Each structure stands twice: as C-alpha cells, then as structure tokens.
Design a protein around this ligand. Structure first.
Ligand code: NA
Length: 57
C-alpha cells in the first residue's frame, strides 16, 4: 500500500521531508503517530511526512 502527496510540503527541519504534490511514498513507520517515516519513490529521500498530506494510491 503506497501513498501519494496531496499538496507541496517544505520540511521545517532535517527530520521532516520536503515533497511535491503527486510524489509517491513507501511508508516505513506509521504506528508512531500521525507523522509517518516515508521514502520518496521519486527521489529516494527519507524523512517524516504529515499523514494528512498523503492518501493511499
Ligand atoms: Na491522508
């Protein structure tokens, strides 16, 4: 189950990940809260993303 970005997002710190609308992710840890550790299938970068900015594909 893959996820896609709904809006652009600029990370505030090194811990979150910036991304563009339409970018897709594999989710690495969702059980930690509403911010999920994810990997971009476009760039390969990794970081936390807000789960309310993605939807399942
Ligand atoms: Na969502």
């Amino acid at each position: 189950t893959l996820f896609v970005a709904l809006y652009d997002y600029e990370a505030r710190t090194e811990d979150d990940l910036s991304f563009h609308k339409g970018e897709k992710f594999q989710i690495l840890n969702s059980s930690e809260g509403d911010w999920w550790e994810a990997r971009s299938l476009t760039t390969g970068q990794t970081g936390y993303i807000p789960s309310n900015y993605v939807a399942p594909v």
